[PDB]
């Protein structure tokens, strides 16, 4: 499978700070199941998103749904079955930071994982249990699909 995280998120804000970039919008979202906060930069020009929209989000280490590493190289000719076919918005990025509420002694109950999808930033914050699959400097795919 190689799915580090999966949930359904509901859009709460589209640009609380303001529309800083024309083709990129910062969605502030919440997940009902795991109660995870999400901040995500999305290319609204090709994938428009509106307030109150619900979407399934999947953060996976690979797209081949067989455990095979993607190698991080573009390969459009590949015909291997891919989990990206089921989803509408696919991004490839690198997790570059993992913050936590851990003190000098106690572990982290809450974790915040930061991913950079070629400049489009994502911040998945919530319970440390749900974010145990995130390791810094690890390539990761983000998969989004609107739900009616």
């Amino acid at each position: 499978a190689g799915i580090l995280f999966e949930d359904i998120f509901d859009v709460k804000d589209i640009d609380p700070e303001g529309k800083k970039f024309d083709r990129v919008s910062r969605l502030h979202c919440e997940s009902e199941s795991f109660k995870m906060d999400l901040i995500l930069d999305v290319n609204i020009q090709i994938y428009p998103v509106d307030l109150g929209d619900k979407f399934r989000l999947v953060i996976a280490s690979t797209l081949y749904e067989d455990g095979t590493l993607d190698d991080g190289e573009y390969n459009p000719t590949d015909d291997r079955p891919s989990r990206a076919d089921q989803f509408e918005y696919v991004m490839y990025g690198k997790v570059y930071r993992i913050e936590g509420d851990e003190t000098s002694t106690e572990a982290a109950t809450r974790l915040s994982a930061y991913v950079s999808y070629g400049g489009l930033l994502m911040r998945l914050q919530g319970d440390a249990n749900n974010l145990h699959g995130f390791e810094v400097d690890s390539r990761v795919y983000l998969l989004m699909k609107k739900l009616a």
Binding site: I98, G100, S104, T105, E135, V136, D137
Partner: protein, 97 residues
């Protein structure tokens, strides 16, 4: 107070030592007092160097020009060796000193 809290090695806190170092290193640090004496000497000479820096820069300007960028070199080492900042390390304090 901040200098002591940030630079004085704390070999008394077993929980913190477990969080930072591996179990064998924690045992070595806690068990024998020779390593503790070495760490205390390290902090003492650092305090002396702190007074020397106070004399050298009465204005308190911490910006200085030096040959090697230790912070960037540490960052380079972390990236090169894939140092995970979450797991406990296997770097032993007397080795550091």
């Amino acid at each position: 107070k901040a200098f002591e809290k940030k630079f004085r090695f704390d070999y008394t806190n077993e929980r913190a030592l477990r969080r930072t170092l591996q179990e064998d290193l924690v045992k070595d640090v806690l068990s024998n007092a020779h390593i503790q004496n070495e760490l205390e000497r390290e902090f003492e000479r650092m305090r002396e160097d702190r007074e020397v820096l106070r004399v050298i820069f009465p204005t308190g300007d911490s910006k200085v020009v030096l040959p090697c960028n230790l912070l960037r070199m540490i960052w380079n080492a972390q990236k090169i060796f894939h140092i995970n900042p979450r797991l406990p390390s296997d770097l032993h304090p007397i080795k550091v000193v």
